[PDB]
Amino acid sequence: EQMRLPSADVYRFAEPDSEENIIFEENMQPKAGIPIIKAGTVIKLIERLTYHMYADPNFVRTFLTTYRSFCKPQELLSLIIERFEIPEPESAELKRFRKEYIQPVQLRVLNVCRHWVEHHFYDFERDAYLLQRMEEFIGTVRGKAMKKWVESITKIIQRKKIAFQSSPPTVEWHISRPGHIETFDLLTLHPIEIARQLTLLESDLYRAVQPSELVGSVWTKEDKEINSPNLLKMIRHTTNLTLWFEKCIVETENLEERVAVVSRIIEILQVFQELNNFNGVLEVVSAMNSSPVYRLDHTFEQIPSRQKKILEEAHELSEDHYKKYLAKLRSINPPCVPFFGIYLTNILKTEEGNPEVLKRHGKELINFSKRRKVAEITGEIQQYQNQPYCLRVESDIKRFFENLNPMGNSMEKEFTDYLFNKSLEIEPRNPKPLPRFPKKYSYPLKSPGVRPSNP
Amino acid sequence: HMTEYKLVVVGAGGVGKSALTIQLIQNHFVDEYDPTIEDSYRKQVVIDGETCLLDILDTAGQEEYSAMRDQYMRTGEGFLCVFAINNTKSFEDIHQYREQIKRVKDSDDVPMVLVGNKCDLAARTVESRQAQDLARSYGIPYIETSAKTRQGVEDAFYTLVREIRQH
Numbered sequence: 377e378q379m380r381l382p383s384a385d386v387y388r389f390a391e392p393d394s395e396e397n398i399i400f401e402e403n404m405q406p407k408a409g410i411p412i413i414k415a416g417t418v419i420k421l422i423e424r425l426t427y428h429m430y431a432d433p434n435f436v437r438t439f440l441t442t443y444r445s446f447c448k449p450q451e452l453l454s455l456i457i458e459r460f461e462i463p464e465p466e467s468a469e470l471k472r473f474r475k476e477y478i479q480p481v482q483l484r485v486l487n488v489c490r491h492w493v494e495h496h497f498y499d500f501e502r503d504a505y506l507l508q509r510m511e512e513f514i515g516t517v518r519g520k521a522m523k524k525w526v527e528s529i530t531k532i533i534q535r536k537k538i539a540f541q542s543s544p545p546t547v548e549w550h551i552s553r554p555g556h557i558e559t560f561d562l563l564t565l566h567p568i569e570i571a572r573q574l575t576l577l578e579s580d581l582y583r584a585v586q587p588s589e590l591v592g593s594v595w596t597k598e599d600k601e602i603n604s605p606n607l608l609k610m611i612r613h614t615t616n617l618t619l620w621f622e623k624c625i626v627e628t629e630n631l632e633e634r635v636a637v638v639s640r641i642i643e644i645l646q647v648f649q650e651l652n653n654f655n656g657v658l659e660v661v662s663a664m665n666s667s668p669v670y671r672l673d674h675t676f677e678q679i680p681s682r683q684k685k686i687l688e689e690a691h692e693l694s695e696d697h698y699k700k701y702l703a704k705l706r707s708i709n710p711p712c713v714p715f716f717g718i719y720l721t722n723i724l725k726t727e728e729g730n731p732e733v734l735k736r737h738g739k740e741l742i743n744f745s746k747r748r749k750v751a752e753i754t755g756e757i758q759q760y761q762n763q764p765y766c767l768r769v770e771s772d773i774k775r776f777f778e779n780l781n782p783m784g785n786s787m788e789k790e791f792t793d794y795l796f797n798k799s800l801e802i803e804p805r806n807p808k809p810l811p812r813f814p815k816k817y818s819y820p821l822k823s824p825g826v827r828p829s830n831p
Numbered sequence: 832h833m834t835e836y837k838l839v840v841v842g843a844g845g846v847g848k849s850a851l852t853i854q855l856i857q858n859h860f861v862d863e864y865d866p867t868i869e870d871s872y873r874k875q876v877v878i879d880g881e882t883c884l885l886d887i888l889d890t891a892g893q894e895e896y897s898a899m900r901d902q903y904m905r906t907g908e909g910f911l912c913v914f915a916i917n918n919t920k921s922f923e924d925i926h927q928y929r930e931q932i933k934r935v936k937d938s939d940d941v942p943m944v945l946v947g948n949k950c951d952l953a954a955r956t957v958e959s960r961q962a963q964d965l966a967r968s969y970g971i972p973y974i975e976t977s978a979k980t981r982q983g984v985e986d987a988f989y990t991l992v993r994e995i996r997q998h
């Protein structure tokens with residue numbers, strides 16, 4: 377039966393639904409049968425975030441991930457404190473309202489606070505007054521059903537303020553021996569271990585990126601260094617490794633030794649493919665398709681066809697706007713290291729290609745579908761961050777790659793031009809004859825292969 | 832089979848370059864873009880009577896993956912070199928983007944277009960004349976566009992298709 381709620385003059389969240397304040401999508405919430413909100417006013421979004429009829433975890437999860445584009449943390453807290461503070465209407469009516477409206481609504485604002493403090497604690501780390509107000513509000517909360525949730529929120533706050541498999545494969549070694557960090561290089565370390573240790577770094581770098589660094593396309597704006605530092609460390613490592621692979625190639629002036637270098641890198645690619653490190657796969661593909669490397673026809677001619685074919689299928693992952701990459705990522709199960717670039721573009725273009733507001737009968741409504749669409753991409757990013765790799769860290773090999781600096785003190789253009797001028801030197805532009813260059817490696821060039829040495 | 836033109840958008844990040852392609856692909860009265868679907872980067876168009884398909888690659892948001900530019904650029908037959916009229920650094924970055932394209936395609940004559948985008952109501956720092964002068968020095972067209980109104984968007988892309996066709 378229809379329930380009597382207070383007037384909008386005293387309580388804003390009692391205003392009835394209309395085309396001017398809340399609209400929905402045609403379909404219904406997957407797994408739950410709940411309407412999908414397309415757009416609404418902030419008051420209507422807060423009402424639905426703390427709805428009395430039912431709990432809406434997906435909307436809560438979406439809201440708290442993307443609300444900062446349309447509402448400030450300080451403003452949201454005020455709104456949820458306003459929501460909680462329910463005045464009784466101006467008996468059968470009052471007893472049912474207390475059990476069917478006040479208790480469910482007050483209980484749902486406490487779930488929001490809990491989810492906020494647990495999953496988006498950064499809002500409180502960056503605004504101590506926001507945490508004073510949250511802790512203050514939570515102190516005023518009294519009741520039988522509340523004590524349980526009020527104590528859980530307090531136990532999360534103090535924890536946040538304080539601050540598992542079988543045996544992994546044996547570490548593989550080639551010419552360089554354990555501890556002899558001074559000899560470590562592309563051809564001296566084992567190609568399986570280079571690919572494993574790079575996959576561990578790249579997996580940790582991938583896992584460290586949070587949605588606070590992605591929502592609002594903040595990695596593309598002036599404060600990107602402040603707001604997206606883990607994403608940027610991650611992209612920079614990737615860029616470093618691509619440039620290192622190119623440097624290794626073009627600074628190996630002897631053709632036979634250079635053929636050994638390109639082959640070894642394709643072996644590192646083959647192991648990245650095995651390990652589902654698509655970041656790694658594309659680091660190698662990007663180095664191979666770079667202007668200095670691509671043009672080395674005398675080098676690729678002498679590469680075995682098995683390795684050419686391996687490189688060819690890895691290249692095709694990037695073709696037709698990452699069609700095969702996308703399909704292959706959906707077909708595999710973790711652990712994996714996705715290529716982040718696609719996610720970055722999709723979030724940017726979603727946010728730049730859709731309006732912040734929709735207008736119905738002259739009134740402005742927040743476009744929540746735009747926000748949901750972004751939370752879907754960040755959710756997919758997080759689904760691949762749960763699973764770790766069952767591979768042992770080799771601390772010296774790890775540190776070797778962490779400390780690579782192929783550019784040195786040079787700027788991008790300087791270094792890029794040097795790599796290209798080395799490419800033209802080692803293999804001149806036709807019809808200039810192919811010169812010969814002395815060998816630079818005292819050790820053997822033959823690979824140990826990509827198949828483990830022991831069981 | 833109708834002709835397919837592989838077009839690549841290159842330009843500075845942080846200055847709303849994505850609007851150029853988004854506005855082309857989305858219908859002039861629709862503002863509901865999903866970058867996930869295939870139709871989001873493919874468009875069947877009629878230019879000078881000859882019907883064709885435009886495939887547009889815009890890696891907007893991947894600027895920090897600087898070592899992937901060569902790869903991305905080699906995909907294209909024609910390039911839209913995009914700067915924002917409200918940001919002089921994005922205009923100053925065009926010279927190196929062009930040099931990089933020439934190197935990737937191993938050619939001094941690559942079908943290319945210079946696009947000046949008006950992304951917001953912020954003040955203009957790049958006078959049309961400066962950009963008109965830069966374009967003439969490279970021997971390519973110059974098209975200005977507005978992200979708010981969709982003005983110039985179609986001319987930018989169509990002008991590039993004609994640069995490819997007349998190559």
Ligand SMILES: *[C@H]1C(=O)N(CC)C(=O)[C@@H]1c1cccc(CN)c1
Pocket residue numbers: 728845846847915916917918950951953
């Ligand atoms: C475009 C631009 O040149 N700048 C920097 C001065 C902006 O901030 C403008 C911009 C950037 C990103 C998206 C949008 C769309 N409103 C606009």
